[PDB]
C-alpha cells in the first residue's frame, strides 16, 4: 500500500543480432565518442526512435491543429535547447530527419573534448568521472550530461581538483612528501 514507484527502461536492442554492417557502424561511433557500450548507442537510438514517432504522428494532423502546434513547438524548442536541431531547420520535418550523431555530439563527454582542455575523447571520460570539470560551481561526473547550448560557455574545470587551482592532489603531494623527507630533515 504505497503508490508504485514508476520506472521504464531507456534502451532498445537490435532485432538482427549479427549484422556486420550495423556492427562496424556501431563500433566507429563508440570509438568516436568514447562510449563503452553498444547500449550507449542502443539508448540513443531508442530516444530518437520515440522522438521520430511523436513527429510522424504530429505530421499526420492538419497544419496548425492545436495539439500539433502546441506539442510540435514544444518538442522543437526542447531539441534546439540542447543543440541537436539547427536554427534553420526548426520545423519538425527535419526533426523527422535527425541522426544519432547529432545526439552523441552534445554529450558532456564530447563537449569537453571540443574545448580541448581534456585533449582526448577518453581523457574526456576519465576527467568527468573524476570530479574535475563543472558547469556552474556544480560539479558534473556523468559523461552523458548532454550540454544545453547555454551552458556550453560554462564547461570548465571545477574550483576543486588540480587543473582548476585548489590543491595538487594526494598522489602528487605524496611525492612532495618524499622530496622534503629524503633531501631535507
Amino acid at each position: 500500500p504505497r503508490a508504485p514507484r514508476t520506472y521504464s527502461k531507456t534502451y532498445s536492442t537490435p532485432k538482427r543480432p549479427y549484422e556486420s554492417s550495423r556492427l562496424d557502424a556501431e563500433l566507429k561511433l563508440a570509438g568516436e565518442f568514447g562510449l563503452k557500450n553498444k547500449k550507449e548507442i542502443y539508448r540513443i537510438s531508442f530516444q530518437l526512435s520515440k522522438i521520430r514517432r511523436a513527429a510522424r504522428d504530429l505530421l499526420t494532423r492538419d497544419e496548425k491543429d492545436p495539439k500539433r502546434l502546441f506539442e510540435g513547438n514544444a518538442l522543437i524548442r526542447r531539441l534546439v535547447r540542447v543543440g541537436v536541431l539547427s536554427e534553420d531547420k526548426k520545423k519538425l520535418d527535419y526533426v523527422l530527419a535527425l541522426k544519432v550523431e547529432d545526439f552523441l555530439e552534445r554529450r558532456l563527454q564530447t563537449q569537453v573534448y571540443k574545448l580541448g582542455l581534456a585533449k582526448s575523447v577518453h581523457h574526456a571520460r576519465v576527467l568527468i568521472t573524476q570530479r574535475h570539470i563543472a558547469v556552474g560551481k556544480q560539479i558534473v561526473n556523468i559523461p552523458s550530461f548532454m550540454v544545453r547550448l547555454d551552458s556550453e560557455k560554462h564547461i570548465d574545470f571545477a574550483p576543486t581538483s588540480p587543473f582548476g587551482g585548489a590543491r595538487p592532489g594526494r598522489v602528487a603531494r605524496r611525492n612532495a612528501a618524499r622530496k622534503a623527507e629524503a633531501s631535507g630533515e
Partner: protein, 47 residues
C-alpha cells in the same frame, strides 16, 4: 599470529581462467584502443 589465513586463490575462487588482456578491465579504454586502432585502418583503405 597463530591463526591460519585465507589464500587469495580460495578467496576470490577463480580457477582455470585463460589469460586475458589488461584492456578488458576498463571498457572506456577498449573503446579508445579500438578507435585508435580502427583509425589506422582507415588510412589504409582510403587516403
Amino acid at each position: 599470529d597463530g591463526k591460519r589465513a585465507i589464500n587469495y586463490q580460495i578467496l576470490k575462487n577463480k580457477g582455470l581462467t585463460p589469460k586475458r588482456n589488461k584492456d578488458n578491465r576498463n571498457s572506456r579504454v577498449k573503446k579508445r584502443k579500438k578507435y585508435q586502432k580502427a583509425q589506422k585502418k582507415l588510412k589504409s583503405v582510403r587516403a
